[PDB]
Every structure is written in C-alpha cells, then in structure tokens.
Amino acid sequence: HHHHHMKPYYVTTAIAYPNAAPHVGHAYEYIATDAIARFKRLDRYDVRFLTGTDGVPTAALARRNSDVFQRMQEALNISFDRFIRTTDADHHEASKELWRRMSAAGDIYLDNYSGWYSVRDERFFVESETQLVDGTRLTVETGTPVTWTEEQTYFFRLSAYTDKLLAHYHANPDFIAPETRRNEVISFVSGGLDDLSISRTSFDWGVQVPEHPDHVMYVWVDALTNYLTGAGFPDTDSELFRRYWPADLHMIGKDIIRFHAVYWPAFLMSAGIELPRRIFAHGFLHNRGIVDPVALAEALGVDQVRYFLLREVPFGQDGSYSDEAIVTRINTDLANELGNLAQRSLSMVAKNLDGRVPNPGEFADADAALLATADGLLERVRGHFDAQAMHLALEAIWLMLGDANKYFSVQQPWVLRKSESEADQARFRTTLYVTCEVVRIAALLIQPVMPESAGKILDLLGQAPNQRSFAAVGVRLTPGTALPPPTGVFPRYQPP
Amino acid sequence: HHHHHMKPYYVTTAIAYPNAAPHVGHAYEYIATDAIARFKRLDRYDVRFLTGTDGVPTAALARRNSDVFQRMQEALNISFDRFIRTTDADHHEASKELWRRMSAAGDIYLDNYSGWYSVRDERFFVESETQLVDGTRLTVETGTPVTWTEEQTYFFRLSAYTDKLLAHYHANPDFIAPETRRNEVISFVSGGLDDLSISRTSFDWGVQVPEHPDHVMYVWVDALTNYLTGAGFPDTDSELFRRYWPADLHMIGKDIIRFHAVYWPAFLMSAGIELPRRIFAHGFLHNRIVDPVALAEALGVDQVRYFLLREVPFGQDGSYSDEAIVTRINTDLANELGNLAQRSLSMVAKNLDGRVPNPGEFADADAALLATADGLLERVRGHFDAQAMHLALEAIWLMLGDANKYFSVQQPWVLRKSESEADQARFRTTLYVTCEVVRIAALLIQPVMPESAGKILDLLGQAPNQRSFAAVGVRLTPGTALPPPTGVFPRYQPP
C-alpha cells in the first residue's frame, strides 16, 4: 500500500470571495502558482495543486464557472490536480466540523449587533470604513453598499487571538510574504482586533450553522474551509489529511490577505488544527497609462504570455502591461537570445555532424567557465522559487543565456566547420557541445514557466520524456545522441 | 573551552559491506544500538553515536542512500549524532594514513598471487571455500561468483598477528560478544592465519594506495577506517580523537565478525592505534526478510522497537510472527503497562483533583514494591552494559507485574468510596506508590520507547528537564498537577 514516495507539497490558489464567480481575474495567479507546482513536481515532490474553489440563477452560474475554468486551464496550460468528489465535500462537512471545534473551544457566542452591513461582502464595517460616494454609503475598501442592520449573529472571539497571532508572526517570519504585506498585517493586528461576526439569520441557501439551523455561515467562512476539504478534512485520520495538511503555500491576491493571514489562522488555532506554512499575496496587473492573460495567450501564444508575466513583474508587486514591453520580450528574450541560439547550433549539428551530438574534446577555460555557470543555475533557481521570486529565477537563466550567446559569438563555430585541421575540427565539436549542453540545462529549468516550448527544445536535443526532471540536470548531454531535424520554437511577434 | 564535562562513549553501527547499499537491512541493528546510545545519554555520558558509513551509477545511488537513511531514521526514531564533514574525510585520508602506518611498520608487501577471486566480496577464497552450485563456482560463504585470477596485489602480514590476536582475546574477555561468537573467532584464529590481500590493480574508482597509484584498496579496507574517521583520524591530536577514540562498542551483524574481530584489530596493532573496547555481533530476524520500518508504519514505532528488543535475546537469531507481536502489543504494552497507568491516573483526576496525593507512612506492602522499583536502575544498567536489552525489559515488566498485583490487592477503587479517615489515607498511599513505580518504569523505558515513555512522563507531570536517570532517585512530588489522562498504548487494530 505504497502509492507515493516523495515528500508531499500542498499548494492552493485563492478562494473566489469577494467575487461570487471563481476563476475570473485569477489567470495571473493561476499561471504563477502553476509554475511553482511544476517546479516542485520536477524537484521530486509529490505535489497536490488545487483551487480554493468548490435555484435557477445559482445553477447556470455553475455551468459558466465550469466553462470559464476549462477555458482558462487549457488556454494557459494550468496543471491543477484532479479532486475526487466525496459525500462530505458535497455537504460542507468541513466548515460544519470547524464550527463545532471552535464552538466547543468556547470561541463562538451569540450576541446582538447593530452596524453597517454589506450584503456583497457579508461583513460589518465601522463608521470610518464607510463613505458616501454620491448620496450612497459604500465601503471605503471594496465600494459595496452598506445598510444599517440590527441582527442576532454568532461571533468568533477573534480578540482572544491578537497576541497569539503576533507570536505566530514572530516565530514564523516566512508565514506571510512579501515583506511589505507582512509589515501591514503585523501593523493591523498590533492595533487590536474586535470579535468577528461569522453568521447571519437567514432562510436563504447557505451552510447552516450546526445546532442552529436559523443561522447560515457567511460565504467566506465556508469558502476558507475549501483548503481543508482539499486535504480530506474533516477526516483527520484519512491518508489525504495526514499526508497533505498543513498546506505548504496559500497563493492569494493582496485584496484578501486579512482573511488568510488573520481570520484563517485564528480559526485554525481555535479548532486545534495545524496552520498553513506560508501565505504569499501577489499584486495586480494593469495596462500602461483589465489585463486578461487568457486573451493575451490566444493572441500571442501561451508560453510568450506566461514568460512575460513571470519575468516582467517582480512577484508580489503590482505590474504594468504595455504592448511594447511584451513585444521586446517575445522578440529579444525568447526569439533571439534563446530561440536563435538553439537554432543556430542545432542547425550545425544536423548539417555538419550528421544530426549527432558531437563528442567534445578537452574543455578549455572558456568552456569550463560557461559550463560552471550553467551547472550552478539549478541551485540558484531553486532558491528563488522557494521565495516565489520566479522573476529572479528567469533573470538568472537569461543571464546565463547572455554568457552563452557571447561565448557562441566569440568561438565562431561556423568558421571552424570549414577547416580540415585536426585542432579546428576538435574545437568545432567542443564549442557546439558546450552550447547544446547549456541550452539543455536552460530548457530543463524553464519547463515550469513555458512547458511546451521547453518540451520542444528538449525534443530537439534528443531528450526522452523520462529524462526531463531536475535530476537530469546533472547528467551531461550524451555524445552520439541522435537529434531530429530542427524546427522553429519561438517565433517573432506578428502584428495583426 | 569546556564544551563537555561527562565521560565520552563512542558507539558505531556496522559498515555496509558486503552490500554496496548502506542502511538497507540494518533497521534491527539501528534500533538496538539506538537504545544503547539513548541509555548512555540518560546515564550522564557524552555519547557519540555514528553510522559506519560515509560516475552516474554512483551519484544517484547516493541519493537513494540518503532517502533510505532519513526514512529509516524517522520511522524508527534513531538518534544518530551529526557528523561534520572535513577535508580529510572527503579525500579518504584515514585509510591512506592507516596504509602508510602499516607499510611503515613493515606489514605490507607486494606479491604475485593466483586463486579464486570474488569481485563482489573483494576477497580471495581457497578451493574448499568454493562450490559448484549449478555449473557456476560460488563462494560457499556468501554465494558470490569467483573467477580464477593471477594478479599482483599488496598483502597485509596477518600471519604475524595470529598469536597477538589470541593474547588480546585472552587478556580482554569482553572484547567479543556474545560468547558463542567469541569461541568461534578464537577457534578460527587458533587454526592459523594466512596473509591478507588488501589491494587490487585496477583503474576503476577507488582509494588509490599511497605511493602506488595503480593499486586501489579493497572497499572493506577503506570502509573499516570510517570508524576512525568518525573520531577525527588521521588528526590524532584533534579534540575528537583524544576524546572519543578508541570506540567503546562496534555493533555489527555476525556476518562480518571476522572483519571486525580479526582483520580490524590486526590493522590497528600494526598501525600503533588503540583497539576498540568491544564488538557485539547480533543475530538476524526471520518469519515463522523482516522489515522493521514497514512494521513500524503499520503497528507503531514503539510497539516495534519494544517487540524486537524483548522477544529475541540479543545476539541470537529471532522469529517474528503476527501472533507473537500482537501478544506483546496487547498484553505487555496496552494492558500490563498502559492500563496500570490509566487506571491509577484516572483515579487521581476524578478523586484527587488531578493532584499527586501526599502518601501516609508506607506499609510493608508499599515498601516492598518501592524497593523493587528503586533497585531496577542498577539491574537495568548491568543488562545494558552486556547489551542484554531483553533482560532489562524483562526486569522492568517483572516489576510491573508486582505493581499490578499490588494494585489489585489494595483495591484503591474501594477505598475512595469510604468517608472514613483511615481508608482515605490508605487510598492516597496506594495511588502514590502506583504512580511512583510507573514513573520509575517510564524513566527506564525511554531508551526502548522514547515517545510513549515521554507521554507517560507527561501524564505524571514530569518536566522535560527531570527525565534523566538522576531523577529516578527523586520521588514523585506530592502536590504535582497532572494533565487529564489520555491513551498511550492502543490495542492492536487488525486491518
């Protein structure tokens, strides 16, 4: 009964709230988290990569959510793992069990409350958190209407966890990232926290509170438990839960950080459940002077868009999109620096070395320096990925590709091809081998960012599909390997 | 510059040879040696507990070794000490220095030789040590193929140390254990020894012989020096070597006893290096191969550690069966130890406000049980010093038998019902005595079942700083607050 060997890694994308519809607006988040998951799969991890998502209006919306999810997954090549339907997941047993544990811990109480309530956010707001935009009172943070409501509601004793949360932040400095987001959460919690309304009296459809069917949970309370549902909760003895909980990484947008970094860990502390290891809040994309990567991918190519978004924007910051910025990356970074270097060297293998990887001679100093830089990339890229700094990992790879192109232009293997010498031909073989070998290493490491284009390059280098994990980075290109006739992988931008 | 104050104790598990894979098949060995090391740490020793281990086919095989090691260490809770890698260790300087010393002493010579050679064992074999099994010539001892080779090789003058080895066995009766293994080694050496080939001419990867780069040492010659490397050798003036060499105990399987009890001490005699103090060769397990890692994941790490160290007299071969381990899980652990702790701790919680009672004056029955418990540490220490962990565990559970008998005779559940003044006093005394002997037993079983014993000590309100053997002589403090009792030893759950 051994169906797994590698260390597990459980990573989630964000719940939909405050949007009723999942997936929409999450393409950037999905591309980034997919690259993280693909990197972990290539680095000998058992990856579990899941979404944070689970009358007549509600059901057709379920078809649209499905259609949007399939299109986004296929257009951007997201490799979410397949979740198995269970009876507990259909009946919201996770949030009901979480409620039971928090109630049994003494952290849930009924009370009367009056204040500004937002139907869309399902939250209460204080006076300073509202504003009259134009004779209509809206929330300052989200812009949703509020009306004054006097309700009976169940509260979570969030105030009893202010210091416990600050102690968790101090003991786990990598729990919240990037650092500007960590400083903001610490500043917020340090000001003190009030108790948190978590239910409403309603007969509308929703997750009924255990023992109190006249109350229903707010949508975001039950939504957060989807992370636990993804690991088989409330079946804490199940193999799924022992293996994958706690989650290693919650990937979210910075708009819902307080739900994940304050409310969520307090809920889990109250219920006696292990907390997630890390929360990373990314920024949002805007046009220069909203950005739809699915439409960009269909127009420009999936790997061009995935590369641009993960390279142009330092992950965590807000990003600016201009057509000029992505055209340069498509034409310079991809088509020229990587594509043309691979095409030039592979063309000489096919035409002058009978389509066979040459056996290199003894490596000169210039050969060893370039190989040493490439051999050191896996360690540097792994460190950047562990901090969710994919832009720095891609910059490191293209810095090596810069050295490789410089090396290629200095060695001039296309002029050594002519000479009938014994030393020029040996130098011809060695320089082509070194260029192919560093292209192989770069192609292996860009698989998380551009899976198909990297796969095509590895096909051109005669690498079987079984020899494409990061363990293969330390195994040099085999002389005598037969290479297929080279074809283009990274085309130049074609204006409409 | 005092980073130590206790007497050092250096104990090793065996080198991998003949198998190229370390750790594989050594789980039973690791568990027993870990219990010995844990006992020494609790007994005010500075313990150094190390393994005897250090192209493309060899690199990823090193990844598998690390995976097997970390999984085995975690599944069985083995507490090997952390080895610091140095420049000398990376370049195999210990075996080079050992070879130099033996050569400088005149004990290594080059010679021609012809005979049956096993590339797997890296040893030569005489005709009577080979056999044709089905048209192929194998060693009778290990079943590896041999081919007739006529090679130049370096020899160690083992014949010059036959009598010196016998004199060492006689002067040090505890050097080899158990006694059946000692008798076999003495009989072998008494028959006389030939000189020992220790190198081969090959351009494969290996430890090149100093001053003769065409020869490489046999893998087991270099492997033996890992024991020296663990103590900082060849840096004989290092703090590690002065403090931890000679090794106090080489724990090995009896399959490689001649490498450790004959070749190894003769090497060290030639090199002028102090000999290890003691070598213990344990037996092998079989079903009526046994995989303790798989057993632990299915049954519980402490259930498996206990069964393996109690069921088989250490040094003998053992037979593990499902019924035999179920008996020890349910009787020895869940009932004899578990329910004795649960029934008495539950009475402290419900009847004595979760507070250790202040006992009255001890009756003859109370003092008799306490006396048996107070004498356990000395008896268990003597068994561990002979590596007789089965006898240490038997001595502890014989006391737990007396405690269960004492508990049933006193009937504390009857005394709690009486509003009398005398009965309530006797009720406090018998509960204190029962908790006190459970505390002593839990302290002494820490080397065998670290986690379960820690849980019992948690239920008895013992802080983590008061769990060494120096705390055995400090009675349970009346007034100590106890957490609500929870289960520690579950009964066997059939799948």
Residue numbers in the entry:
A (entry chain B): -4 to 49, 63 to 297, 307 to 513
B (entry chain A): -4 to 49, 63 to 296, 307 to 513
What does the paper say about this structure?
Dh-MtMetRS with a double His tag was used for the crystallization of the apo-form enzyme, whereas N-terminally His-tagged MtMetRS was used for the crystallization of the Met-AMP-bound enzyme. The crystals of F-state MtMetRS diffracted X-rays to 1.9 Å resolution, belonged to space group P1 and contained two copies of MtMetRS in the asymmetric unit. In F-state MtMetRS the entire α2 helix (residues 50–62) connecting β2 and α3 disappeared from the electron-density map, suggesting high flexibility of this region. The KMSKS loop forming the distal end of the AMP pocket was completely missing in the F-state enzyme. Ile10 and Tyr12, which constitute the upper wall of the methionine cavity, push into the methionine pocket (Cα displacements of 2.6 and 5.1 Å) and hence the pocket essentially collapses. Collectively, our crystallographic investigations revealed a previously unobserved active site in F-state MtMetRS which appears to be nonproductive. We illustrate in Figs. 4(a) and 4(b) that while the active site is well ordered in P-state MtMetRS, the methionine pocket collapses and the AMP pocket shrinks significantly in the F-state enzyme. The cavity of the active site has a volume of 2186 Å3 in the presence of Met-AMP; in contrast, it reduced to 360 Å3 in the absence of the ligand. In sharp contrast, we found that F-state MtMetRS is characterized by a completely collapsed methionine pocket, a nonexistent AP and a severely reduced groove for adenosine. The HVGH motif adopting the rare β-turn conformation in the apo structure is not involved in crystal contacts, suggesting that the observed conformation does not result from crystal-packing artifacts. The unusual F-state structure of MtMetRS observed here reflects the intrinsic flexibility of the catalytic core, which is unique among the characterized MetRSs.
